[PDB]
From Swiss-Prot, chain D:
It comes from Staphylococcus aureus (strain MW2). This is Large ribosomal subunit protein bL25. Part of the 50S ribosomal subunit; part of the 5S rRNA/L5/L18/L25 subcomplex. Contacts the 5S rRNA. Binds to the 5S rRNA independently of L5 and L18. Belongs to the bacterial ribosomal protein bL25 family. CTC subfamily. The chain holds residues 2 to 95 of 217 of the full protein. This is one of the proteins that binds to the 5S RNA in the ribosome where it forms part of the central protuberance.
Swiss-Prot record, chain E:
GO terms for cellular component: ribonucleoprotein complex; ribosome. This is one of the proteins that bind and probably mediate the attachment of the 5S RNA into the large ribosomal subunit, where it forms part of the central protuberance. In the 70S ribosome it contacts protein S13 of the 30S subunit (bridge B1b), connecting the 2 subunits; this bridge is implicated in subunit movement. Contacts the P site tRNA; the 5S rRNA and some of its associated proteins might help stabilize positioning of ribosome-bound tRNAs. Pfam families: Ribosomal_L5, Ribosomal_L5_C. GO terms for biological process: translation. Part of the 50S ribosomal subunit; part of the 5S rRNA/L5/L18/L25 subcomplex. Contacts the 5S rRNA and the P site tRNA. Forms a bridge to the 30S subunit in the 70S ribosome. It comes from Staphylococcus aureus (strain MW2). Belongs to the universal ribosomal protein uL5 family. Keywords: Ribonucleoprotein, Ribosomal protein, RNA-binding, rRNA-binding, tRNA-binding. InterPro entries: Ribosomal_uL5, Ribosomal_uL5_bac-type, Ribosomal_uL5_C, Ribosomal_uL5_CS, Ribosomal_uL5_dom_sf, Ribosomal_uL5_N. This is Large ribosomal subunit protein uL5. Disulfide bonds: none annotated. One of its GO terms (molecular function) is tRNA binding.
Swiss-Prot record, chain F:
It comes from Staphylococcus aureus (strain MW2). This is Large ribosomal subunit protein bL31B. The gene is rpmE2. GO terms for biological process: translation. One of its GO terms (cellular component) is ribonucleoprotein complex. The keyword Cell division does not apply. It comes from the Bacteria. Belongs to the bacterial ribosomal protein bL31 family. Type B subfamily. Part of the 50S ribosomal subunit.
Swiss-Prot record, chain G:
The lineage of its organism: Bacteria, Bacillati, Bacillota, Bacilli, Bacillales. Keywords: Ribonucleoprotein, Ribosomal protein. GO terms for cellular component: cytoplasm; ribonucleoprotein complex; ribosome. It holds the Pfam family Ribosomal_L33. The gene is rpmG2. One of its GO terms (molecular function) is structural constituent of ribosome. NCBIfam families: PRK00504.1, PRK00595.1, rpmG_bact. Disulfide bonds: none annotated. It comes from the Bacteria. Transmembrane segments: none annotated. SUPFAM superfamilies: Zn-binding ribosomal proteins. It comes from Staphylococcus aureus (strain MW2). This is Large ribosomal subunit protein bL33B.
Amino acid sequence: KKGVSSTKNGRDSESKRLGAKRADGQFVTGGSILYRQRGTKIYPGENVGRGGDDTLFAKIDGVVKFERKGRDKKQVSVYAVA
Amino acid sequence: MLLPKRVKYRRQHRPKTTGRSKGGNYVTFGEFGLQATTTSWITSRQIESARIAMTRYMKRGGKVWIKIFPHTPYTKKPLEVRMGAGKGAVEGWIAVVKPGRILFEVAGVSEEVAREALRLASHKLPVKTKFVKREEL
Amino acid sequence: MISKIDKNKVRLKRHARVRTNLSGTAEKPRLNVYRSNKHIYAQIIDDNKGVTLAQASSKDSDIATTATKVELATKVGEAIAKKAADKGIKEIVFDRGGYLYHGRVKALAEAARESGLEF
Amino acid sequence: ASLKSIIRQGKQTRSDLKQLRKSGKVPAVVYGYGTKNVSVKVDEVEFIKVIREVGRNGVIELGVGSKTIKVMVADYQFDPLKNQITHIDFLAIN
Amino acid sequence: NRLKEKFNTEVTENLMKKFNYSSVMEVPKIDKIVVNMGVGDAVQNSKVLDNAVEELELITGQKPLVTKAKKSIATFRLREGMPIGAKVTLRGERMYEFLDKLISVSLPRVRDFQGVSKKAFDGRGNYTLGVKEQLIFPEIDYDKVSKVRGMDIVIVTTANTDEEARELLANFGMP
Amino acid sequence: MKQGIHPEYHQVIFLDTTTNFKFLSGSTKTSSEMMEWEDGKEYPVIRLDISSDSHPFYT
Amino acid sequence: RVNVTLACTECGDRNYITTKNKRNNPERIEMKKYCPRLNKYTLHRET
RNA sequence: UAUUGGAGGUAGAGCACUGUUUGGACGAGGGGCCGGUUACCGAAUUCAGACAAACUCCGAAUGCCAAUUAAUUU
RNA sequence: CUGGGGCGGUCGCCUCCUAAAAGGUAACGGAGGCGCUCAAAGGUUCCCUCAGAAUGGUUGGAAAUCAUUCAUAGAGUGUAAA
RNA sequence: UCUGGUGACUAUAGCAAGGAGGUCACACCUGUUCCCAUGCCGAACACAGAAGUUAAGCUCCUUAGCGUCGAUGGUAGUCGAACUUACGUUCCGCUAGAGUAGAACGUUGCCAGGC
């Protein structure tokens, strides 16, 4: 088994299950996480809030819709009619 | 045309050698050119051999342009070692080529002299080649 | 060499920076203020539909007169309050435009508060 | 400068295009002022003869149906290995 | 209000036709002057700052604000935010009385061959000069001072470029 | 005029013997030896100079 | 840096745990917080 | 599976960023010298070229999440 | 643990790439950090915009400070990286 | 469509340039005594006033230099299949990036005086 040859890079962290958590069209209850992120890949829109961890959660019950903000930025919305 | 003066990451994943030339498929600087028809590596040492042959055969005549630069480093493990224990150290610098990638360009010299020079370069080189002129029309 | 500018572009930067939280709904509409070198305007607007529900200005002939500008602001505010009470608007969100809440904008706000509008 | 062409039709697959290129002809399109986006194909040899006859730029009569179109080459495609022309673009001046 | 009066009756008069303008608002007007002391090596000293604060607060009607260093510089000891130099702006009548004072105290002490200055500019109409505090402090003598410094004087004008700063150097000065 | 706690200036009458160029100012709040009215009733702190008398160009 | 237990000056109860540096703030850090016994805000010292 | 709606940045391309690079313009700094000239050399600025797991102005195929909903199955 | 043991290295956390455009994903694979710090580098209210570059100059090691038009942030964000 | 607020859209909306215009709205302006005002200016901010003037900001009109947008055709790639061991081949959907023609010097909602 070789001998003394050793490497200084065998380390990593535990991945965080970030990304999307709900899709456009489904009924989310209020509080449902829609998109765990870092920084702002998606800003909150209508009836959506920003956690301390940049998490996005619905304010109220309703359907979820991802949309465009300006040219290079996206937001999230929730609408209650159900 | 030997080695990159500095690279960020010195130990790198080896290059893909399957597909077609992303670019450099045309004679732009010189008049005649030499393209490749298979796809091997070029090790910063066979092109050195080739430019010497051409340049010294033209007797310091017309100009030459090398179109391939050895960017990728490659590693070789030390002799008689087992598998594992890290990645080896850099042994040379390479530049993958593709069928259709022009390699060498020449100008300011007659056609037959250029063809002879590129022929002599072709044999110091590990890839099948082809003689081409500045595309026009 | 330096270039002087009109004070409105800078103003419309701060007004948007305040509009970021201030948005008029039908229940709680937004009262804007547009101060000129000689006049002051005001509109009640629901931003959820983009409709102005009431308006008043120092140019409006009912209010136009000879005063100290802070004094006619005290009149623009009073008028906006009346017009809103007719439509049924009690609670509003005062948008100060991008003007410091002071002098004229303050005068208008204070006037509208004393005359009914709950903000 | 009196080249002729033939009118392409819809949904020419990969196989059809490559067979068409493997014969002595090459697909192309025309556009610009005085016409619409018509997709045609021309025989390679006559294109090359016309180009060496007129050069890079030339107000060329182009044969489509019955109407001749004063046209010049906007720009073109080539295969460096297996020397063969691939797609010609044409703009009309008129 | 000396050059003040001389503006509306003479600069407004003469420059308005030395160059053609369609309205009267298109005329060069001096806006203000920044009187930055510049930079003295107060790395081991901190005294040279308040004496520099004596000058300008004495010469001009106001104290210089000590703009500390922006970036950290080696060679001399200017760490991020080292209090160095000075800054004063003259906008109102003071621009005028102080300018007048300047042009009426230039010749005795400067010993300038031209009289005041030449092509010391930045190319867009600003003096970027430097004195050796020879002319300044006529009022307070060289007798109560300890160093020899010079400001980064500039000209803040509605004028366009230093070519125009010469025609407004005909404002009593010496081009 | 960096105001607030600004020091005391004055447009004083620099009534020098060389043209009496009393169109200057400064913090030279000295005794008004010449309490005139055409110029400021302040000190003629300028007493002798060559600004209006001897220029290297216009001597 | 050291751990600090803050205590109500009136009540007398240790209701809060926080941190301070013993060089930057070498003195008993004080500050107003909620004593849950007196339903009011009292002064709490790092006693 | 058919039809909508969406998150994401791989293949491919590209050089706009971090870099890696080959030729050609163009003026200029320490400096050949007396601050210097001229060569250059360290870059500024361009035009044409290229390279990349830890580059991206771009960006598929397909996978995935879900639907007012259909059709076939279990 | 270990491309047989031994010797050398490693062991828990965070970041990046490998990772095949959801998520996840291994090797003694390729790179780095953590075992803290901040009574303001926290809360809130009101204000303000940056690095560099030349048209440059009292200093000018060049660029310290000062000036002026462009600066898409090329700067800053207590620290590694995203 | 004028004019001024206000806000809806991926800069087809922007920059630069040339040219108008001040319809009483808009900025410019006079000053600091007045609340206020600025680690450091009536600079700004605030304020009292409107005698000067459109010069600039602003507004409107031109122009594609500049910015952005941008097909069709294609090519690269690839889902599935059939060959196959080739740095592969074939078929079938889908279909870039780049480039070329071109779009483009905005569309628009409510309000108040306009005409």
